[PDB]
Amino acid sequence: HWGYGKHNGPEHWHKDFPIAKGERQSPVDIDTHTAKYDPSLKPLSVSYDQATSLRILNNGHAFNVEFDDSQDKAVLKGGPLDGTYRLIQFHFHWGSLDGQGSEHTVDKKKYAAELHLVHWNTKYGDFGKAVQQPDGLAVLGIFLKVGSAKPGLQKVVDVLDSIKTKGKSADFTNFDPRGLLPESLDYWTYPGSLTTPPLLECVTWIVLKEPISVSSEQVLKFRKLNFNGEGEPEELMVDNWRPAQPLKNRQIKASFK
Numbered sequence: 001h002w003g004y005g006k007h008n009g010p011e012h013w014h015k016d017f018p019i020a021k022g023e024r025q026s027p028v029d030i031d032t033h034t035a036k037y038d039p040s041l042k043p044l045s046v047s048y049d050q051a052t053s054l055r056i057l058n059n060g061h062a063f064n065v066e067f068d069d070s071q072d073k074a075v076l077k078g079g080p081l082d083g084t085y086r087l088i089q090f091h092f093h094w095g096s097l098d099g100q101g102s103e104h105t106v107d108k109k110k111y112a113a114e115l116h117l118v119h120w121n122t123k124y125g126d127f128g129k130a131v132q133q134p135d136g137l138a139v140l141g142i143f144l145k146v147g148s149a150k151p152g153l154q155k156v157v158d159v160l161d162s163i164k165t166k167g168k169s170a171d172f173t174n175f176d177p178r179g180l181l182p183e184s185l186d187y188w189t190y191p192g193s194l195t196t197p198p199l200l201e202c203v204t205w206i207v208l209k210e211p212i213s214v215s216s217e218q219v220l221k222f223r224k225l226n227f228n229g230e231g232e233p234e235e236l237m238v239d240n241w242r243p244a245q246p247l248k249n250r251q252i253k254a255s256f257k
């Protein structure tokens with residue numbers, strides 16, 4: 001099965017998922033001098049006051065914090081988006097070392113990690129229908145750098161011991177994803193893909209310019225997770241990031257001057 005090892009990592013994915021070599025793959029390098037300010041882009045509307053978190057799951061590739069998306073409780077609107085996108089889950093990608101881990105890069109700079117808040121377009125009715133559409137998903141990407149602790153992350157860090165291995169889940173109610181946001185909602189945006197198989201070309205990417213700070217102790221706890229199942233030889237969950245893909249015939253737009 002696909003993963004992030006020497007034998008099943010990103011350079012292998014094209015054999016089972018040929019869209020890996022497609023025209024709108026993610027992530028990409030954001031060249032900050034080549035991105036054009038688009039004064040027609042609206043401020044992002046992040047409406048997370050009624051978010052209902054349910055569960056946290058180790059899926060063998062990352063961990064997902066899942067939300068109740070059976071109503072408009074936590075939605076993303078505005079910016080480059082038409083209509084209403086409902087939050088379904090968030091997850092991270094991170095490195096074995098602080099100098100790598102992000103999927104997007106900024107002038108080839110890699111951050112220690114990247115948060116992905118995944119949303120689906122309510123005009124398609126469910127997430128599985130939305131991933132078949134070129135405007136099906138909106139993913140809000142937020143870089144993490146190592147410095148001061150992020151207080152709003154600690155409730156996630158403290159549950160990771162209970163989902164160490166693939167297939168483990170834990171109740172995770174009353175988590176407020178507003179505690180993961182930076183101060184500024186300035187962003188870059190471009191049309192792209194899922195960054196894991198099946199690599200579907202269904203994503204409007206919205207990547208925030210301002211990183212959040214997390215502590216070395218917080219990211220060390222991410223790196224204690226396991227790719228393996230319980231009672232299998234330990235393989236640490238690190239370096240679960242896809243490198244930057246060719247931009248091809250795409251333009252990255254900036255919300256800011």
Ligand SMILES: COc1cc([Te]C[C@@H](O)C[Se]c2ccc(S(N)(=O)=O)cc2)cc(OC)c1OC
Nearest residue numbers: 116118127128129131139193194195196197198
């Ligand atoms: C949940 O129901 C389904 C789900 C799926 Te496609 C799930 C899973 O295999 C990948 Se979800 C995902 C989300 C975000 C990212 S990222 N890193 O942010 O780019 C990467 C991957 C297809 C289905 O049918 C078409 C479906 O039937 C209902």
Ligand SMILES: [Zn+2]
Nearest residue numbers: 091093116195
């Ligand atoms: Zn992701």
